[PDB]
């Protein structure tokens, strides 16, 4: 949204992106952290594992959809995004929404005991057994654990998720150059912030190219397998936005 952004423009952009995240982060960090000792009991975990495949799938689809709505709001408030053509807005969100959710998950992940905040308490990956995709779940928790090692600040999460969304490499963009310019300026913002805080060492540690895409592609595959097994449940219960995004 401007060729040759000045230092002042880039400082403003850091502020703007952090504000957009602040207004759309969904879960309050202090709430999440203060509830780390609240963990599902053995009985509660058993409860979850005894749940039907369809019920667990519909719960998880609901909660993901709620998370995705906050990412959409983030995108809408994100400097430059609404200026993009309508096609490219959709291409970026279809590709990036779930990626942003996977990144936002590190805030809700306790590396100490490998638990995630879900339905009011922290639970391990075993909580999700009824989904029937344990290896994918394990991969997702592994990914969260790799992020936990960076110990992002809230401002870092803001600037990094902006870049996860504004990725000029997504196939199907019609005005690639505009996205490349937005991406570059967001990179300048992220790099500026890291430079001032002496945190540019994180750059080398960020998730490898294609990793987020892999996790998302597996999610879609597992959804297709589920949908094949329980087609009426998806029709009757799953949020339409979720189907549009992933089916």
């Amino acid at each position: 949204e401007a060729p040759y952004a000045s230092l002042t423009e880039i400082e403003h952009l850091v502020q703007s992106v952090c504000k957009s995240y602040r207004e759309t982060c969904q879960l309050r960090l202090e709430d999440l952290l203060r509830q780390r000792s609240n963990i599902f009991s053995r009985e509660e975990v058993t409860g979850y594992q005894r749940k039907s495949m369809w019920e667990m799938w519909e719960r998880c689809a609901h909660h993901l959809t709620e998370a995705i709505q906050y990412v959409v709001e983030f995108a809408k408030r994100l400097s430059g995004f609404m200026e993009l053509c309508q096609n490219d807005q959709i291409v970026l969100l279809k590709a990036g929404a779930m990626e942003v959710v996977l990144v936002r998950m590190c805030r809700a992940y306790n590396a100490d005991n490998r638990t995630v905040f879900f339905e009011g308490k922290y639970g391990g990956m075993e909580l999700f057994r009824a989904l029937g995709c344990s290896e994918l779940i394990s991969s997702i928790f592994d990914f969260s654990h790799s992020l936990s090692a960076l110990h992002f600040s809230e401002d870092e999460i803001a600037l990094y998720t902006a870049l996860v969304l504004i990725n000029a490499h997504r196939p199907g963009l019609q005005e690639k150059r505009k996205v490349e310019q937005l991406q570059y300026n967001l990179e300048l913002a992220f790099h500026h912030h890291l430079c001032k805080t002496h945190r540019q060492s994180i750059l080398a540690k960020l998730p490898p190219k294609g990793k987020l895409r892999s996790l998302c592609s597996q999610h879609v595959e597992r959804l297709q397998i589920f949908q094949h097994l329980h087609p009426i449940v998806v029709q009757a219960a799953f949020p339409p936005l979720y189907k549009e995004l992933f089916s």
């Binding site: 959409v72 809408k76 959709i90 936005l241 549009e244």
Partner: peptide
């Protein structure tokens, strides 16, 4: 493949 909803969300005021 279907993006009617996403389109509506984006233009939701």
């Amino acid at each position: 493949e279907k993006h009617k909803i996403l389109h509506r969300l984006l233009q939701d005021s």
